[PDB]
């Protein structure tokens, strides 16, 4: 048991929202989960904690003097479905270095043994712009074993997806991390499903699932909760339940096969028009 996963993808593509909803589904199935927020903005746990967490590791460590004076209990909180939540934390936009904060945060979790023995899953929710080594911390040796890239039929999102695939290769070749697949978080573009499927095939992976764009997500979000909690009978709620199962039973873990910019342009022209 105990599977660690990292979620990556285009900025604002919906990874923090999808993760929390996917996790709420998992807890519904009776799975024990921890979500590790790896983004300066400590917003990867609001729908689960029903509030913006304030006890972030970095801020908590700055107060206690050093991370060495910190303690799990102070930063690790349980929310909906018994889901465990921790937030790396970081500086306000435009100052400091958020990457280093993530390195420090992850090591602290590692050394405090947060990654407990009876967890079924651990999800690292990473920001969209992996602009440095610090944000690859989740996929170093003995961390996440599977990666899921969230994207959409949008040209720029698919480019970010391929681009990230390139960055994964160094880590996948030196370790055991593998790309588990692409999660299409639909944005109503034309022939969107064909686009993602073609890119997945080119990368050598699969389109795990296709989450539809549904404003119910926004209404649930406004009330600080996932769709599974907000409205269990919602059609979208079942979409996440299906995503959860696809994840749980997934056995396809490969090493990204990055394509060139030209190959990507050629792919957009072929499956993008009409």
């Amino acid at each position: 048991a105990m599977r660690q996963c990292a979620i990556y993808g285009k900025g604002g593509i919906g990874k923090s929202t999808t993760t929390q909803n996917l996790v709420a589904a998992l807890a519904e199935m009776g799975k024990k989960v921890m979500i590790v927020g790896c983004d300066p903005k400590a917003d990867s746990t609001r729908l689960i904690l029903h509030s913006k967490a304030q006890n972030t590791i970095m801020e908590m460590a700055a107060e206690a003097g050093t991370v060495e004076d910190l303690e799990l209990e102070d930063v690790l909180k349980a929310g909906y479905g018994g889901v465990k939540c921790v937030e790396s934390g970081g500086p306000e936009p435009g100052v400091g270095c958020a990457g280093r904060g993530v390195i420090t945060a992850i090591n602290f979790l590692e050394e405090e043994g947060a990654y407990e023995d009876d967890l079924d899953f651990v999800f690292y929710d990473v920001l969209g712009d992996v602009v440095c080594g610090g944000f690859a911390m989740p996929i170093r040796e003995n961390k996440a074993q599977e990666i899921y890239i969230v994207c959409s039929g949008e040209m720029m999102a698919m480019y970010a997806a391929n681009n990230i695939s390139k960055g994964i290769v160094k880590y996948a070749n030196s370790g055991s991390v593998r790309l588990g697949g692409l999660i299409c978080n639909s944005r109503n573009t034309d022939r969107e499903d064909e686009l993602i499927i073609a890119l997945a095939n080119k990368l050598g992976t699969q389109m795990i699932h296709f989450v539809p764009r549904d404003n119910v997500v926004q209404r649930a979000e406004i009330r600080r909760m996932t769709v599974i909690e907000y409205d269990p009978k919602a059609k979208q709620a079942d979409e996440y339940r299906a995503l959860a199962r696809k994840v749980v039973d997934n056995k396809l873990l490969v090493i990204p096969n990055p394509i060139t910019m030209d190959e990507l342009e050629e792919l957009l022209m072929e499956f993008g028009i009409m």
Binding site: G133, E141, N173, S174
Partner: protein
């Protein structure tokens, strides 16, 4: 001018009248310096309690620190392994500094390499530098191992050392089986000693973590010893000597005494002696592991207990009388070997020296600083001697350590006026030796500037420095000394008393003034 028969270097030379005249004109014409009255006024001010309070209120400014950064320690630790080349991933300016810092203390050659990451490597990452770097080092300096540590630059950008090394191997830059242990050594975390601790744990993990299956505790009948950051050659030697004298099988893990003391015989040896690879791989089979300086071997301890399953004894550094005794008795209990008549005699000789010199050492107030374990050892020994440590400063100390030092101080009547300061620097200590004058101060060469300042206030205010610690740059070959064991205690004791007697002779050398007390027999 110069007299070819008696040439003058800068010191005597610039005291010649023409040079004095010149410097006087330089000052008055273009330096726009503050009047001498203002300078003296401000000087006096910096010696008061009012200034001291402002001084201790500092929150952002550090002045004259008593510590170095992590990588310095990682390098020293790597030098302790056979044919190992310290490799620092990051900027080359660092390595240039680590080498010359050590060159100056040991006055020996210090081999260390860098992969010179520049502007574009800080941007795109330092993986290429690692691939070409490991290949170039191996081919050029033919080491049998490359111990990798980091500069702050590589730490900020989170360069993945493990992934770079693994890919360097996967791509043929170096053989798959070539040992390349590594450690993340943040210049902004801890101090040089933390670097030593991280580097060592990283080396122990590389040779041991994946191969614990066949290991059995106590099977090789030896005792592992981890010295920690040590810059006194005599400390490595006295430990080996005492164990061998007890007929105790031991394995010193990280032993740089040979590379730091090669003979000048017409041949340069980049590598010498050092802890072998086989010794490290076999370490888990030892009966137990002893950590000589526990306060900066915290990470190592956690690894040795969790992975090796050794019940690491709770021992203080073997300095002074009581802690050396405790060390020996523990080693005897772990190895079964009795403490020999030899060591019993050595202990008795130290006690003899203590009794012979106690009247001169009694009540003498000292200010001292250094690394955690060292400083605590000195405090403990000082107390046994009947001395009064009054200002104890450890810049890289922490709260727990301070709590332990306070307990050692409270257990003795001689610790009544002592205070322990952590996170304070030599400018703070400067204030303390003015407002609460000690007879002497014990520390590294950086304290010479403090002795300089105190004398400026007046001869009666001068606080002589007693050179013990790291680094020592203004005296020669003091790195050959010993501070551990009875031997070390004997050396420290001789130095303290004779320093005291020296100063006494200086104060009473005045003829028909103070020489009435210039006794031939002390």
């Amino acid at each position: 001018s110069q007299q070819v028969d008696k040439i003058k270097a800068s010191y005597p030379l610039f005291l010649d009248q023409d040079y004095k005249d010149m410097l006087a004109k330089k000052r008055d014409g273009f330096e726009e310096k503050y009047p001498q009255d203002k300078i003296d006024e401000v000087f006096q001010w910096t010696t008061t309690k009012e200034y001291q309070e402002l001084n201790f209120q500092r929150e952002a400014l550090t002045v004259n620190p008593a510590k170095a950064c992590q990588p310095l320690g990682a390098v020293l630790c790597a030098l302790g392994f056979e044919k190992t080349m310290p490799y620092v991933h990051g900027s080359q300016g660092c390595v240039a500094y680590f080498r010359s810092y050590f060159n100056r203390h040991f006055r020996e050659p210090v081999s260390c390499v860098s992969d010179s990451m520049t502007e574009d490597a800080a941007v795109f990452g330092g993986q290429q530098n690692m691939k070409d770097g490991l290949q170039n080092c191996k081919a050029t300096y033919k080491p049998d191992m490359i111990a990798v540590s980091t500069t702050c630059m590589a730490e900020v950008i989170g360069d993945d050392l493990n992934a770079f090394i693994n890919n360097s191997k996967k791509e043929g830059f170096i053989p798959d089986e070539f040992p390349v242990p590594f450690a993340h050594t943040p210049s902004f975390v801890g101090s040089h000693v933390t670097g030593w601790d991280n580097m060592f744990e990283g080396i122990a993990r590389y040779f041991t973590l994946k191969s614990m299956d066949d290991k059995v505790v106590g099977s090789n009948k030896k005792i592992n010893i981890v010295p920690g950051f040590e810059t006194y050659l005599g400390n490595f030697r006295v430990i080996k000597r005492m164990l061998s004298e007890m007929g105790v099988g031991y394995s010193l893990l990280s032993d740089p005494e040979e590379v730091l003391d090669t003979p000048a015989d017409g041949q340069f040896r980049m590598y010498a002696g050092g802890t072998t690879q086989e010794e490290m791989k076999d370490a888990p089979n030892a009966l137990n592991t002893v950590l000589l300086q526990p306060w900066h071997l915290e990470k190592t301890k956690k690894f040795v207990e969790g992975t090796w399953k050794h019940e690491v004894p709770k021992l203080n550094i073997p300095m002074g009388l009581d802690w050396t005794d405790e060390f020996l008795m523990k080693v005897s209990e772990i190895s079964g070997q009795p403490i020999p008549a030899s060591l019993t005699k050595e202990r008795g000789r130290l006690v003899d020296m203590m009794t012979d010199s106690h009247t001169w050492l009694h009540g003498k107030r000292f200010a001292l600083w250094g690394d955690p374990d060292f400083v605590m050892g000195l405090v403990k020994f000082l107390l046994e001697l009947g001395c009064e440590p009054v200002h104890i400063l450890c810049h890289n100390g922490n709260k727990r350590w301070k709590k332990a030092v306070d307990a050692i101080l409270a257990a003795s009547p001689y610790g009544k006026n002592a205070t322990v300061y952590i996170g304070k620097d030599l400018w703070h200590l400067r204030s303390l030796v003015f407002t609460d004058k000690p007879d002497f101060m014990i520390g590294n060469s950086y304290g010479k500037f403090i002795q300089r300042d105190t004398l400026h206030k007046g001869k009666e205010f001068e606080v002589p420095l007693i050179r013990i610690g790291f680094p020592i740059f203004d005296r020669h070959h003091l790195h050959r000394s010993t501070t551990l064991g009875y031997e070390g205690a004997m050396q420290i004791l001789t130095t303290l008393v004779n320093s005291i007697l020296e100063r006494l002779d200086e104060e009473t050398r005045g003829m028909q003034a103070t020489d009435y007390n210039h006794d031939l027999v002390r």
